[PDB]
Design a protein around this motif. Structure first.
Motif, PDB file in Angstrom:
ATOM      1  N   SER A  25       0.931  -1.181  -0.052  1.00  0.00           N
ATOM      2  CA  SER A  25      -0.116  -0.059   0.076  1.00  0.00           C
ATOM      3  C   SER A  25       0.830   1.081   0.026  1.00  0.00           C
ATOM      4  O   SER A  25       0.467   2.187  -0.632  1.00  0.00           O
ATOM      5  CB  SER A  25      -0.888   0.125   1.099  1.00  0.00           C
ATOM      6  OG  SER A  25      -1.639  -1.273   1.347  1.00  0.00           O
ATOM      7  N   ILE A  26       1.903   1.187   0.695  1.00  0.00           N
ATOM      8  CA  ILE A  26       2.808   2.424   0.934  1.00  0.00           C
ATOM      9  C   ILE A  26       4.128   2.394   0.255  1.00  0.00           C
ATOM     10  O   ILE A  26       4.930   1.574   0.595  1.00  0.00           O
ATOM     11  CB  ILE A  26       2.519   2.978   2.503  1.00  0.00           C
ATOM     12  CG1 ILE A  26       3.329   4.131   2.531  1.00  0.00           C
ATOM     13  CG2 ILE A  26       3.552   1.989   3.454  1.00  0.00           C
ATOM     14  CD1 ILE A  26       2.635   5.442   1.784  1.00  0.00           C
ATOM     15  N   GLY A  67      -5.816  11.158  10.325  1.00  0.00           N
ATOM     16  CA  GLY A  67      -5.996  11.106   8.886  1.00  0.00           C
ATOM     17  C   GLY A  67      -5.088  10.351   7.988  1.00  0.00           C
ATOM     18  O   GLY A  67      -5.302  10.050   6.853  1.00  0.00           O
ATOM     19  N   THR A  68      -3.786  10.454   8.328  1.00  0.00           N
ATOM     20  CA  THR A  68      -2.830   9.425   7.767  1.00  0.00           C
ATOM     21  C   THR A  68      -3.178   8.216   7.945  1.00  0.00           C
ATOM     22  O   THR A  68      -3.857   7.685   8.961  1.00  0.00           O
ATOM     23  CB  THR A  68      -1.303   9.564   8.270  1.00  0.00           C
ATOM     24  OG1 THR A  68      -0.796  10.942   7.528  1.00  0.00           O
ATOM     25  CG2 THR A  68      -0.485   8.323   7.979  1.00  0.00           C
ATOM     26  N   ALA A  69      -3.224   7.456   6.558  1.00  0.00           N
ATOM     27  CA  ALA A  69      -3.792   6.153   6.453  1.00  0.00           C
ATOM     28  C   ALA A  69      -3.096   5.291   7.590  1.00  0.00           C
ATOM     29  O   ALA A  69      -1.907   4.766   7.411  1.00  0.00           O
ATOM     30  CB  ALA A  69      -3.538   5.678   5.061  1.00  0.00           C
ATOM     31  N   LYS A  70      -3.864   4.897   8.736  1.00  0.00           N
ATOM     32  CA  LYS A  70      -3.217   4.068   9.614  1.00  0.00           C
ATOM     33  C   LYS A  70      -4.122   2.724  10.008  1.00  0.00           C
ATOM     34  O   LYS A  70      -3.760   1.690   9.948  1.00  0.00           O
ATOM     35  CB  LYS A  70      -3.349   4.757  11.173  1.00  0.00           C
ATOM     36  CG  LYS A  70      -2.120   5.852  11.332  1.00  0.00           C
ATOM     37  CD  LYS A  70      -2.705   7.030  12.084  1.00  0.00           C
ATOM     38  CE  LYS A  70      -3.966   7.476  12.228  1.00  0.00           C
ATOM     39  NZ  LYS A  70      -4.456   8.339  11.084  1.00  0.00           N
ATOM     40  N   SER A  71      -5.527   3.135  10.069  1.00  0.00           N
ATOM     41  CA  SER A  71      -6.609   2.070  10.309  1.00  0.00           C
ATOM     42  C   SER A  71      -6.639   0.964   8.749  1.00  0.00           C
ATOM     43  O   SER A  71      -7.225  -0.082   9.270  1.00  0.00           O
ATOM     44  CB  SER A  71      -8.146   2.674  10.135  1.00  0.00           C
ATOM     45  OG  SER A  71      -7.904   3.298  11.698  1.00  0.00           O
ATOM     46  N   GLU A 127      -8.949   3.753  16.573  1.00  0.00           N
ATOM     47  CA  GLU A 127      -9.475   4.881  17.306  1.00  0.00           C
ATOM     48  C   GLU A 127      -9.653   4.970  18.448  1.00  0.00           C
ATOM     49  O   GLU A 127     -10.654   5.098  18.741  1.00  0.00           O
ATOM     50  CB  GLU A 127     -10.113   5.727  16.167  1.00  0.00           C
ATOM     51  CG  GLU A 127      -9.768   7.406  15.900  1.00  0.00           C
ATOM     52  CD  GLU A 127     -10.250   7.683  14.515  1.00  0.00           C
ATOM     53  OE1 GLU A 127     -11.034   7.258  14.006  1.00  0.00           O
ATOM     54  OE2 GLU A 127      -9.517   8.730  14.265  1.00  0.00           O
ATOM     55  N   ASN A 170      -5.222   8.122  18.044  1.00  0.00           N
ATOM     56  CA  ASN A 170      -5.446   9.481  17.254  1.00  0.00           C
ATOM     57  C   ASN A 170      -4.692  10.559  18.421  1.00  0.00           C
ATOM     58  O   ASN A 170      -4.818  10.640  19.380  1.00  0.00           O
ATOM     59  CB  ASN A 170      -6.750   9.739  17.004  1.00  0.00           C
ATOM     60  CG  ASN A 170      -7.117   9.495  15.609  1.00  0.00           C
ATOM     61  OD1 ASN A 170      -6.893   8.240  15.244  1.00  0.00           O
ATOM     62  ND2 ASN A 170      -8.046  10.322  14.948  1.00  0.00           N
TER      63      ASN A 170
HETATM   64  N1  LIG Z   1      -0.034   4.734   0.562  1.00  0.00           N
HETATM   65  C1  LIG Z   1      -1.356   4.689   0.607  1.00  0.00           C
HETATM   66  N2  LIG Z   1      -2.375   3.567  -0.081  1.00  0.00           N
HETATM   67  C2  LIG Z   1      -3.397   3.740  -0.411  1.00  0.00           C
HETATM   68  N3  LIG Z   1      -3.964   4.555   0.376  1.00  0.00           N
HETATM   69  C3  LIG Z   1      -3.570   5.634   1.100  1.00  0.00           C
HETATM   70  C4  LIG Z   1      -2.183   5.522   1.187  1.00  0.00           C
HETATM   71  N4  LIG Z   1      -1.640   6.584   2.128  1.00  0.00           N
HETATM   72  C5  LIG Z   1      -2.993   7.234   2.384  1.00  0.00           C
HETATM   73  N5  LIG Z   1      -3.839   6.460   2.012  1.00  0.00           N
HETATM   74  C6  LIG Z   1      -5.463   6.608   2.059  1.00  0.00           C
HETATM   75  O1  LIG Z   1      -5.830   7.781   2.986  1.00  0.00           O
HETATM   76  C7  LIG Z   1      -6.713   7.409   3.772  1.00  0.00           C
HETATM   77  C8  LIG Z   1      -6.556   7.416   4.967  1.00  0.00           C
HETATM   78  O2  LIG Z   1      -7.994   7.068   5.964  1.00  0.00           O
HETATM   79  P1  LIG Z   1      -8.145   5.835   6.867  1.00  0.00           P
HETATM   80  O3  LIG Z   1      -9.285   4.858   6.149  1.00  0.00           O
HETATM   81  O4  LIG Z   1      -6.747   5.143   6.855  1.00  0.00           O
HETATM   82  O5  LIG Z   1      -8.454   6.129   8.312  1.00  0.00           O
HETATM   83  P2  LIG Z   1      -7.490   6.809   9.087  1.00  0.00           P
HETATM   84  O6  LIG Z   1      -6.327   7.243   8.177  1.00  0.00           O
HETATM   85  O7  LIG Z   1      -7.201   5.391   9.854  1.00  0.00           O
HETATM   86  O8  LIG Z   1      -8.013   7.862  10.138  1.00  0.00           O
HETATM   87  P3  LIG Z   1      -8.422   8.028  11.806  1.00  0.00           P
HETATM   88  O9  LIG Z   1      -7.555   6.711  12.303  1.00  0.00           O
HETATM   89  O10 LIG Z   1      -7.806   9.192  11.997  1.00  0.00           O
HETATM   90  O11 LIG Z   1      -9.707   7.547  11.720  1.00  0.00           O
HETATM   91  C9  LIG Z   1      -7.281   6.139   3.467  1.00  0.00           C
HETATM   92  O12 LIG Z   1      -8.428   6.033   2.482  1.00  0.00           O
HETATM   93  C10 LIG Z   1      -6.182   5.535   2.504  1.00  0.00           C
HETATM   94  O13 LIG Z   1      -6.444   4.961   1.320  1.00  0.00           O
END
Ligand SMILES: Nc1ncnc2c1ncn2[C@@H]1O[C@H](COP(=O)(O)OP(=O)(O)OP(=O)(O)O)[C@@H](O)[C@H]1O
Lengths: 334, 567
Positions: A25-26, A67-71, A127, A170
């Motif tokens: 993914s990253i 909001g960085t993709a962690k979940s 979260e 968070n």
């Molecule tokens: N390298 C990546 N590949 C795919 N998607 C990414 C990447 N980096 C960021 N994203 C996108 O960023 C979004 C982050 O939202 P996500 O569903 O991860 O909630 P979160 O980031 O865990 O926010 P919180 O935990 O604060 O609720 C995701 O939709 C994800 O697809």
């Protein structure tokens, strides 16, 4: 097609090939990739005589950005790893859905949590950090004593909680602070600070070249309409944490003391946020984790020094603009 | 013989029973019995070493004329060892056989039980002490030394044409007046080809220590069943033809059964409790068929294991497959053999003996004995001896060596048995602690070849491997271990060494020598072989044991000594 293992599994380049199958993914973020990669199958009971049962446990934590993709990082863990349950932040009051045992009410249904329901595996959180303090209390033994103990019913029996813990929280303060100190970044109480582990963070600042690179990668990811596969390494880790049972031997275990002193002397009241004698032993957990990533069962300076590499990076991560303490201290180590 | 010399034995004596051995105690307790029988008080002794021996005699600075030591003797021209011996009667009965000749000769204070089909060393004294070259035991042409010394008339005498004896050839000069020395050295060295064949290339053991003693006391009309068992213990120690040889096994099937079967003191009334006269049966050297389940004791012996390679999983797979053909249940494979039900535990060996013929093992069954005291249970052939070796418990109290000896000799009675089960337990835990190191060391690849042998060294002290019996046992499980599976068929035949840490003794890095594979009669180089480097550089070495295959060094003064000892 079962020696799929031992046509390849013994190469030197396989330190990093496991990273390529974490979450495809990253673009960046080798660190947490490797940390979850080791901690998915690391573990040792090593029950000494009658004292206690040490750990099949760790609590890696990433306190990043709202909001960085962690979940999303978490899900592939479940889609590969053998056990789980899904739970998000705002669970119960940590009691759980304390029964008295009768044939009235037709047995007054019974359970106490989910680490009671999933031991030696995983069950998921998301979260967390904006949850009832009355749960951050409650879970605060099972992580390390790996033991439950209840009362307050027709019974006072007890039950086993051997697990590890998801993290997914968070931060507070909007998005993420400068290099100004971490205890100021999110405010959890004193007797919870006790344990801590894999300290990573998704600190952000803008590079347009990287923006170009990953965004190409993204649109390419959005362009699939209709080294390792997930087909295999699943079974490698079943095998690895099930059957082989590593060890350690005296090689250089005195060096650990000098580095612990490097904490206590370079870090007293600046950063050193009570990081007692759990994370140190997590040092061992990394080393044993590495050798099981190799199916080695013993090791030289390699695995332990890899632990020192990763920890040296992180604890430079979570300082002030004066960010290079152990950096200057360890060019001689490095 | 001593159907005549035993009739000397009435006066005072000292009965010494040299350093720890199962030949020792079995051979000596019988004689303690014998000797409080004819109303003699005497002395039994613990031996801690040749220095322990010498101080012991020093503490017994009397004129006890009937001195006795057993299972020793090859150390010196022991009149040189034991100077104040004047005509004192000693008795040697040792199976450490490659013994000096000056102890054999000098028919004064020694017992030459010289009886062997090897008439190979007759002039072995007739030239080393009897001849000499460039010597001082002589006369000179001057009139001040005009006395005739101990004129052997040989090289022991002068070499200046003064030798009244030595009448094989010319007198004044063969090719020169001192070609005496030439031919002296010719014979000297050309037959040191055979002297150095003795004592400086190889050592072994010979015969029993105490089966001769059984026949001695048999001629005085004693049918002591227990004495048969004690001697059985003495032999079944190094009946282990891989450890040190018996040979006569298929000949003692006549010998001892003939001692015991033909004289049947009760042919019709023996179905009684106490000491119902011994029996004989063909069974195993499987460790401990009896008091344990199969599946742990099918796992700690080397010979059952090495041929089927169980310290890795796959051995267990084929194991289970042969339990399958055997059809043992796994529960039953994890309850004690006696704790099993009946019919299986009767038919067990009955089937195993014939349908192990076909699956990689041939050499597990033996011929031995067993008997009851009473109704408690039916003790086993060797489960004494493997309980004994576990009594060499070198605790830091400083009394426990000699005390454990005294305990051991007080064990093989029919009385003291609460300890015997103790010995069993101690033995088992050590026995699987053996296995506990092999996986660690094999798959860590600690098999240091380092040239012409295999070689081990270890790092700290275990109470198992403080003392060296356990150490030889370590070396003798790994060796088969490694050399089964890591090799082609070329290099399975080379010897082995092993360090042995002693954190107790200030740092000495003990060692034991041991031999390559499957050559029963072709035994140790190491009767002397280590001593080469002792000559070449030579550093603080010891050979204190009458056991040859052992040394004791400093902690760290070995490696360069080893590099010299490459060859
Ligand atoms: N390298 C990546 N590949 C795919 N998607 C990414 C990447 N980096 C960021 N994203 C996108 O960023 C979004 C982050 O939202 P996500 O569903 O991860 O909630 P979160 O980031 O865990 O926010 P919180 O935990 O604060 O609720 C995701 O939709 C994800 O697809």
């Amino acid at each position: 097609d079962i020696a799929t293992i031992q046509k390849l599994s013994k190469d030197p380049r396989i330190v990093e090939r496991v990273v390529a199958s974490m979450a495809p993914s990253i673009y960046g973020h080798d660190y947490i990739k490797r940390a979850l990669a080791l901690a998915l199958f690391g573990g040792e009971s090593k029950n000494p005589g009658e004292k206690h049962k040490v750990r099949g446990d760790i609590n890696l934590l990433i306190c990043g950005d709202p909001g960085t993709a962690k979940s999303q990082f978490l899900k592939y863990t479940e889609k590969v790893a053998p056990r789980a349950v899904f739970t998000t932040g705002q669970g119960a009051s940590a009691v759980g859905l304390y029964v008295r045992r009768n044939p009235v009410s037709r047995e007054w249904t019974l359970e106490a949590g989910a680490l009671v329901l999933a031991d030696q595996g995983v069950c998921l959180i998301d979260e967390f950090d904006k949850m009832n303090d009355q749960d951050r209390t409650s879970i605060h033994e099972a992580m390390e004593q790996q033991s439950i103990s209840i009362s307050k019913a027709g019974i006072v029996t007890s039950l086993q909680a051997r697990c590890t813990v998801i993290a997914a929280a968070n931060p507070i303060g909007g998005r993420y602070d400068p290099s100004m100190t971490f205890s100021e970044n999110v405010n959890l109480s004193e007797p919870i600070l006790s344990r801590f582990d894999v300290l990573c963070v998704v600190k952000d600042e803008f590079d347009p070249m990287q923006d170009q690179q990953l965004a190409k990668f993204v649109v390419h990811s959005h362009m699939k309409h209709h080294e390792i596969p997930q087909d295999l390494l699943r079974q490698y880790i079943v095998y690895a944490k099930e059957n082989i049972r590593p060890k350690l031997t005296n090689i250089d275990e005195d060096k650990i003391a000098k580095m612990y002193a490097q904490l206590r002397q370079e870090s007293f009241a600046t950063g050193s946020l009570p990081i007692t004698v759990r994370h140190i032993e997590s040092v061992i957990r990394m080393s044993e984790a590495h050798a099981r990533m190799h199916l080695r069962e013993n090791v030289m300076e390699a695995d332990v020094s890899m632990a020192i590499r990763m920890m040296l990076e992180s604890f430079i991560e979570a300082q002030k603009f004066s960010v290079m303490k152990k950096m200057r201290s360890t060019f001689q180590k490095y | 013989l001593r159907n005549d010399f035993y009739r000397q034995l009435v006066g005072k004596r000292i009965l010494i029973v040299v350093n720890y051995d199962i030949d020792a105690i079995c051979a000596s307790r019988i004689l303690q019995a014998l000797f409080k029988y004819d109303h003699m008080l005497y002395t039994v002794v613990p031996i801690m070493g040749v220095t322990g021996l010498k101080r012991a005699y020093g503490e017994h600075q009397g004129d006890v004329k009937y001195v006795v030591l057993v299972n020793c003797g090859g150390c010196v021209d022991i009149v040189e060892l034991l100077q104040p011996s004047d005509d004192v009667t000693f008795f040697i009965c040792d199976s450490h056989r490659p013994l000096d000749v000056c102890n054999i000769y000098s028919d004064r204070q020694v017992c030459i039980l010289g009886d062997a089909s090897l008439e190979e060393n007759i002039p072995a004294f007739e030239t080393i002490f009897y001849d000499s070259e460039g010597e001082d035991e002589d006369e000179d042409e001057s009139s001040d030394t005009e006395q005739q010394h101990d004129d052997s008339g040989a090289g022991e005498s002068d070499q200046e044409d003064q030798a009244p004896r030595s009448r094989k050839l010319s007198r004044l000069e063969r090719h020169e007046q001192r070609i005496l020395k030439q031919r002296a050295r010719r014979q000297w060295e050309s037959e040191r080809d055979r002297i150095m064949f003795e004592y400086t290339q190889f050592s072994y053991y010979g015969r029993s220590a105490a089966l001769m003693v059984f026949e001695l006391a048999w001629k005085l009309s004693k049918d002591n069943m227990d004495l048969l068992w004690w001697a059985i213990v003495g032999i079944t120690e190094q009946l282990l033809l891989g450890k040190i040889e018996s040979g006569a096994y298929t000949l003692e099937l006549e010998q001892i059964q003939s001692h015991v079967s033909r004289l049947t003191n009760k042919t019709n009334d023996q179905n009684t409790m106490s000491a119902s006269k011994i029996t004989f049966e063909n069974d195993l050297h499987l460790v401990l068929y009896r008091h344990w389940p199969v599946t742990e004791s099918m796992r700690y012996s080397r010979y059952s294991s090495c041929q089927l390679k169980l310290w890795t999983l796959r051995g267990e797979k084929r194991l289970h497959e042969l339990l399958l053909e055997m059809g043992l249940p796994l529960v039953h494979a994890r309850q004690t053999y006696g704790a099993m039900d009946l019919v299986l535990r009767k038919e067990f060996f009955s089937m195993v003996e014939r349908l192990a013929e076909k699956y990689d093992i041939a050499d597990i069954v033996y011929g031995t004995f067993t008997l009851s005291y009473g109704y408690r249970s039916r003790y086993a052939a060797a489960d004494y001896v493997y309980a004994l070796l576990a009594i060499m418990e070198s605790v830091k109290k400083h009394k426990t060596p000699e005390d454990c000896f005294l305990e051991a000799s007080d064990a093989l009675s029919r009385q003291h048995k609460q300890l015997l089960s103790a010995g069993i337990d101690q033995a088992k835990l050590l026995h699987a602690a053996v296995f506990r190191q092999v996986q660690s060391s094999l798959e860590a690849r600690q098999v240091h070849s380092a040239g012409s042998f295999f070689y081990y060294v270890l790092q700290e002290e275990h109470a198992f491997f403080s003392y060296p019996y356990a150490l030889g046992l370590l070396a003798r499980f790994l060796l088969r271990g490694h050399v089964a599976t890591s090799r082609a068929r070329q290099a399975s035949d080379l010897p082995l060494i092993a360090s042995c840490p002693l954190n107790a003794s200030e740092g000495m890095c003990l060692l034991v020598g041991i031999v390559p594979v499957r050559e029963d009669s072709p035994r140790n180089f190491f009767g002397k072989a280590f001593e080469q480097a002792a000559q070449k550089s030579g550093v603080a070495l010891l050979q204190d044991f009458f056991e040859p295959a052992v040394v004791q060094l400093r902690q760290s003064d070995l490696t360069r000594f080893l590099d010299s000892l490459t060859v």
